[PDB]
């Protein structure tokens, strides 16, 4: 007759207040159905008192009892109606039902009754694919799939649990300055792009194809989420940072409290050292700032003193090796670019009437391939490289006419020794040459070189090459790869599958605060006069240059052997357990990512069966057929004309499509992500910008090559405010939250009450654990110390799938979280 159960809910920062008429529940039948086929609905029941009885409860979180009124005639709740009649919202985590128990998985804000169309309702934990769903649940399913589809216009609110797709028109801000408007990126065969949330909040007064400015960026309600420690809330600080720390540091400089260029490599290491004297009143800006305050360490008074860089940590000086510069290029912030060579002279696709022969200067007869010949090193498979050229060659003209920067587009020749090690034998620094040019600059090849002035030639070529890895590492291998590429699939999976949908179950752990962090990066980090923008070569077309590179961007490339295999860096090899068999044997991100690509395999090929029996059950899937064609129709719309698209009419197609989502999310975002401030925190290391071309002979620019080697550096990369405001992005986007959930982890531990899955979770976490081992005795096996650890002696811990809080460089998290 009378039903026991527990809500446990957090209040939005007491108790009693919760009582008396505050908050209502209404249970609802899984078995009985009324006169329309709809679940029983039971009465309005509230709360009735502070259940103060198991431990097992902290995050600020409180138990409250609860009686339902509830004949066996009634049926088998399977879900429950819930209304706030209070001002204020409050998070509601759970509802359990005793006597056997059902469990309610809630994690949403539930705010007051007034401001929603339709009652906020939650489902029982047991998962079904549409064909399994009880006949009384069917419509109330399909009625909540369609409130969070919307209706595709209007003005997104907080409380609002709305998605839909819309182009990037909110970068630019032409209403305040017509140098501030920017190309709409999406829709167009000029600019294709992935789409983004929708938050509708109109057009501005100058341009009716960009969206107005905005206080507050809307993101479906649940994807905000909060933290119980204010440290937590990583996201927040870019804002900060672009909006006051920015301003004061720049004051500073305004006012001349402090050298306007750093002017030896010692002024950059004083960073984590002694520290940064400021004027009082800058540090009295950024030290009460939440996130902001734990970048740097204070006296409370005028300094500010950086963290110690992991790759300085054992040697100083070691990121100038010639060995370091290649050894990250497969275990660095950006290892996956990397690509075989097997033909010489490397080619160019791009039209010599636009920009003059394209033929390459590089010589093989001038290189040093430890003995070897050409083709010897060819058809070894020995030759490899890091090629910019194409890429950055149409962009070099409209870059290089902005005041204070400048760049070649470059490219790199890689030897693979018999020791197992790259070398650098060559860079190319190329330039585009039409009819009328202005400039006398001109292309040139620049070689290894130890002493003298042309040792100081080879250092700034290696920091152009740099300049454009680190542009296209936050461009497109962190933002367009990660980032934006996975927003389409985060926005497809709330509108068209079930939160009791096997794969929604699969995929969304892997979603965790990914809208979050897109909204926020659209407000103040990819936005005209932006974070990036502001400190990174391209200045105004950073970001439509990662549209170009959309043009070719490839779903099913994404999975890491098709990625190795098309970078000329593996093999198909059916005799090896991946099915590839890597040309360079010690290739730390490869290895170790086959790793952890099989973990994930192995889980979703186990998982999957439990719920499709066969390829027919796949295609006849409603709610699984309209995701896909919807994500890629719309959500990745732009290229919805390619051949490669897969179909999903298969068991084959689904696991494929699941395995190269999650990789995505968590593995690749991971080794992308999380060695930013490791191996960037050193300026030099890793330039985000240069500001001048290689000086002519007799000039006094080339006087100082000569002259002061580290002057001629410093004044060519970043100059010292952006690099300040840079530095301290990198360091907050490196850091881990102590509330992330990592692979091999879930929020909750009844996410379904299906045993089998639960059982083949428990399995990929032990298998996860088992690999962290292996990785443990790689790095410290003797024999691949070269490649592993290098001259900088850091261990490639980044893709280990364990990590404690803070700037670790190791842990996999679920998702795309910062
Ligand atoms: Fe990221």
């Known amino acids: 007759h009378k039903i026991k159960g527990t809500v446990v809910l957090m209040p939005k920062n007491n108790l009693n207040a919760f009582l008396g008429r505050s908050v209502s529940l209404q249970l609802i039948s899984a078995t009985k159905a009324d006169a329309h086929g709809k679940g029983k609905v039971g009465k309005d029941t509230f709360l009735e008192g502070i259940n103060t009885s198991l431990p097992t409860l902290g995050a600020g979180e409180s138990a409250f009892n609860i009686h339902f009124e509830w004949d066996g005639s009634m049926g088998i709740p399977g879900a429950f109606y819930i209304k706030n009649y209070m001002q204020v919202e409050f998070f509601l985590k759970s509802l359990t039902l005793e006597a056997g128990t059902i469990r309610f998985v809630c994690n949403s804000w539930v705010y007051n009754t007034k401001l929603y169309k339709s009652v906020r309702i939650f489902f029982a934990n047991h998962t079904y694919v549409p064909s399994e769903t009880p006949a009384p649940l069917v419509s109330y399913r399909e009625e909540e799939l369609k409130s969070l589809r919307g209706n595709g216009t209007g003005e997104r609110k907080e409380y609002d649990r709305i998605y839909d797709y819309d182009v990037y028109n909110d970068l630019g801000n032409p209403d305040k300055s017509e140098k501030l408007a920017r190309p709409v990126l999406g829709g167009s065969s000029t600019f294709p792009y992935p789409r983004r949330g929708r938050t509708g909040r109109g057009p501005t007064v100058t341009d009716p194809n960009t969206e107005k400015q905005g206080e507050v960026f809307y993101v479906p309600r649940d994807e905000n989420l909060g933290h119980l420690k204010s440290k937590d809330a990583l996201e927040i600080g870019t804002k900060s940072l672009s909006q006051i720390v920015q301003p004061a540091f720049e004051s500073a400089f305004d006012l001349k409290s402090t050298p306007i260029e750093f002017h030896s490599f010692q002024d950059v290491h004083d960073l984590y050292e002694g520290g940064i004297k400021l004027p009082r009143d800058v540090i009295s800006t950024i030290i009460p700032l939440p996130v902001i305050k734990e970048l740097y360490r204070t006296d409370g008074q005028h ?78 498979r020995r030759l490899f490289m890091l090629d910019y050229h194409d890429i950055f060659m149409p962009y070099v003209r409209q870059i290089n006419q902005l005041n204070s920067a400048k760049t070649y587009a470059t490219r790199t020749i890689l030897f693979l020794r018999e020791d197992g090690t790259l070398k650098p034998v060559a860079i190319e620094l190329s330039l585009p040459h039409s009819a009328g040019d202005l400039s006398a600059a001109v292309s040139q090849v620049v070689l290894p070189a130890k002493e003298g002035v042309e040792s100081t030639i080879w250092l700034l070529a290696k920091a152009y090459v740099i300049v454009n890895d680190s542009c296209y590492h936050q461009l497109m291998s962190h933002w367009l790869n990660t980032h934006a590429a996975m927003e389409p699939f985060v926005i497809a999976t709330h509108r068209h599958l079930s939160v009791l949908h096997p794969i929604y179950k699969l995929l969304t752990p892997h979603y965790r605060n990914n809208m979050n962090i897109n909204a926020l990066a659209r407000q103040s980090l990819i936005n005209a006069n932006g974070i990036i923008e502001t400190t990174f070569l391209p200045s105004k077309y950073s970001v439509e240059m990662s549209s170009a590179v959309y043009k070719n961007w490839v779903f099913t490339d994404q999975a890491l052997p098709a990625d190795l295999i098309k970078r000329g860096v593996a093999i198909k090899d059916p005799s090896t357990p991946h099915g590839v068999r890597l040309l360079i044997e010690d290739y730390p991100y490869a290895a170790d990512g086959l790793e952890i690509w099989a973990a994930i395999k192995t889980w979703v090929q186990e998982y999957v069966p439990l719920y499709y029996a066969r390829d027919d059950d796949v295609k006849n899937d409603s709610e699984l057929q309209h995701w896909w064609k919807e994500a890629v129709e719309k959500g990745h719309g732009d290229l919805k004309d390619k051949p490669w698209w897969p179909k999903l009419q298969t068991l084959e197609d689904l696991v494929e499509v699941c395995l190269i989502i999650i990789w995505i999310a968590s593995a690749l975002h991971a080794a992308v992500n999380f060695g930013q401030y490791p191996y960037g925190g050193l300026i030099m290391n890793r330039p985000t910008a240069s500001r001048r071309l290689l000086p002519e002979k007799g000039t006094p620019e080339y006087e100082e090559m000569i002259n002061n080697h ?35 982890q879930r929020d909750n531990p009844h996410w379904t009450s299906d045993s089998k899955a639960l059982q083949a979770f428990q399995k990929f976490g032990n298998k996860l654990k088992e690999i962290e081992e292996k990785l443990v005795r790689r790095n410290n096996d003797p024999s691949l110390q070269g490649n592993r650890l290098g001259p900088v002696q850091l261990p490639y811990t980044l893709l280990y799938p364990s990590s404690e809080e803070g700037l670790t460089f190791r842990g996999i998290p679920n998702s795309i979280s910062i």
Not at 332 to 341: A, T
């Open 710 to 744: 580290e002057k001629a550096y410093l004044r060519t990369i970043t100059s010292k405010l952006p690099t300040l405001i840079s530095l301290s992005v990198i360091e907050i986007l490196s850091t881990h939250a102590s509330d992330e959930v990592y692979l091999g």
């Open 303 to 380: 300094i500010l003193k950086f963290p110690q860089p992991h790759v300085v940590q054992v040697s100083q000086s070691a990121w100038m090796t010639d060995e370091e510069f290649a050894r990250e290029m497969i275990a660095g912030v950006n290892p996956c670019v990397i690509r075989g060579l097997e033909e010489f002279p490397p080619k160019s696709n791009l039209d010599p009437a636009i920009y003059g022969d394209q033929s390459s200067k590089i010589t093989a007869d001038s290189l040093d391939l430890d003995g070897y010949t050409m083709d010897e090193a060819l058809g070894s």
